[PDB]
Subunit: 155 residues, 4 copies
């Protein structure tokens, strides 16, 4: 007995899908997350080399919600330019959520242009659907999008 | 495999942080034991380190900093699924004369969900020769846009569970 | 099962703590690469978070606090069996002009074994167009009754292993 | 290739072996160790109910050696009044020691008197025997002895 919710975010960028994708899939990116997102993390623990299987423990600055959660780099698909990251411990999972997934899909539009289609799907017990829907947003994915965009839009 | 942890090093508006509304919730457990007996357990400095005993399977981890008297800090981590997952707590007042105890959330828990101040007060008042009310109340200050979110969570539960568990101990010979 | 952690809250003599003897140990790695190339790696603020890469299987856990420039603190935990098991370290000086770097043990490690002060200095000095000496030295202050105990442990190893590992990187095209 | 060393400590006490033994074997004793040894521990983590199987993580105040080690309540023998506690992680095991055991044996002398025979045995690689023998002493056991003694010598 869980309700499924899926939220979406899109971002057009004046760079090739391939260029934006190398950065998203780049295993060194994990240890550079504080560089892309200054002041977003109080503490970031990386278990693994940044490729699939890598777990990230994330604790945020006092006041913010999810104060702390773990994450797993679960899947990568280079041909489709697709990446799935799962919340595995803490955060919304202590708040009636039984499943939490992020999908990032970089789809080309023209020769030197693409969309970043970021989505997150979750499953919540009906009792917690109203407690938790004003909390879960597309924020963390939109932040990844804006940072990667700007870092790559440098000739 | 390779553990690597990275911690780097902006404040909010001076009016924004005080821009709250007070909510007060009460709980009354009237029990058939003297106020003195209930109070001696509540004010017992050894109670902290026996909370796992009193409340089995509530804590995944319990850290206590200090002797157990006023000033003591309790860092409480709860089992996966449960929420508030972790918060710190402080013993503000242990007033024997009035049978009055105050404990405050000082970090984590609802403080990361719009709450700016959170106080438990426990007052044990006589009702007869061998009976008393345990009056537990919690006062919190919330950003009003968060009251919808945080109110179903902030129940009278954890201090109600305390009062019952202490009462049970006493009512046993 | 039940985790329960308890942390409570006396100082030593003012002359006792300064009652040490200085020991200085040197290491010189003269390599066939320019001092500029060796220095750019040593002074590179990204080097901290790539120490697991540079030195595989040395760390069980590496925490870095700060950007990587002066002021940065490194908390290093090593695999079971190895000793110093854990210590904190601080970037005191990164002097481009002199190709001079100082890093200090500020907590743990040999500081719990009679040592009261511990400084690594790395000075990269030219020897020719494409050669230099990496002069690493460590100065520590020990309580003299502990010198027998701590001297076989405090070797020139960890800063010798650094110098070689950096040299290898550079000497590759 | 390890050298075996065994050190001993004895303490006569004007109380019955049985009285001193109830306290040594008392599963609630673990959580009372900071009470017996004020200021000895910076931080004491107890995993378990204080009976056999219990692991204790011990971190000490800056300056002291073993800064931190884990311990296991390995064996109890009530008839012989005997207790064995093993160092399982950290401390001397990061310093060439491959085995570390404490035995506490409370043996009665007269009707209302006993000895506390505390010993510790360790195995060290020959390279580390000289580095580590000025460090390992009977200190932690003698402290247990003096504290338990005095707490029990109260009519």
């Amino acid at each position: 007995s869980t309700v499924t919710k899926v939220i979406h975010h899109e971002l057009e960028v004046a760079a090739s899908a391939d260029d934006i994708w190398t950065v998203y899939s780049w295993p060194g990116l994990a240890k550079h997350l504080p560089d892309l997102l200054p002041g977003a993390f109080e503490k970031l623990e990386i278990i693994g080399d940044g490729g699939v299987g890598t777990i990230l423990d994330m604790t945020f600055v006092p006041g913010e919600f999810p104060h702390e959660y773990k994450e797993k780099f679960i899947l990568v698909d280079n041909e489709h330019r697709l990446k799935k990251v799962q919340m595995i411990e803490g955060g919304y999972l202590d708040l009636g959520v039984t499943y939490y997934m992020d999908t990032i899909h970089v789809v080309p539009t023209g020769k030197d242009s693409c969309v970043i289609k970021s989505s997150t799907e979750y499953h919540v017990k009906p009792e917690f659907v109203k407690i938790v829907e004003p909390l879960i947003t597309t924020g963390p994915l939109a932040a990844m999008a804006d940072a990667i965009s700007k870092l790559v839009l440098e000739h």
